Design a protein around this ligand. Structure first.
Ligand SMILES: Cc1cn([C@H]2C[C@H](OP(=O)(O)O)[C@@H](COP(=O)(O)O)O2)c(=O)[nH]c1=O
Ligand SMILES: [Ca+2]
Length: 129
């Protein structure tokens, strides 16, 4: 898998973000994760956390997996990095997202994220408190 450039347009919620990719605006849905909706418990904290991460970044990158790159709603599907650190992983590590929506072909970083979920759960963090 390969990292490609993109720039923040705007933070949306815990697991979606609007980025400019190859010079076009698109909404990205983070692969392999599910944050609570803003309206739910930990939803605001998940939104704040992703927002801070992407807004503080000097360099945003997007990394497509091997499978589908767009979902049925036209959202890009990717791993998103902020100054070299994966947002998808960090959301899970902090107990602000669950590993979710694991579809064969688009699941390269499954193991890595499940490891982070286990540590988050052991610490009883946020969603696991
Ligand atoms: C993360 C992800 C979501 N989706 C779809 C499945 C869900 O369909 P439904 O909307 O029919 O439930 C929806 C969940 O995204 P949200 O968690 O953003 O709602 O997006 C994909 O198709 N592929 C993916 O990799
Ligand atoms: Ca969600």
């Amino acid at each position: 898998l390969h990292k490609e450039p993109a720039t923040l347009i705007k933070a949306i919620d815990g697991d979606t973000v609007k980025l400019m990719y190859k010079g076009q605006p698109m909404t990205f849905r983070l692969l392999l994760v599910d944050t609570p909706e803003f309206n739910e418990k930990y939803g605001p904290e998940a939104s704040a956390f992703t927002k801070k991460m992407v807004e503080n970044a000097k360099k945003i990158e997007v990394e497509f997996d091997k499978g589908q790159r767009t979902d049925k709603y036209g959202r890009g599907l990717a791993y998103i990095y902020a100054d070299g650190k994966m947002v998808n992983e960090a959301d899970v590590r902090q107990g602000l997202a669950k590993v979710a929506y694991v579809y064969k072909g688009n699941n390269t970083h499954e193991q890595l994220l499940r490891k982070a979920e286990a540590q988050a759960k052991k610490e009883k963090l946020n969603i696991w408190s």
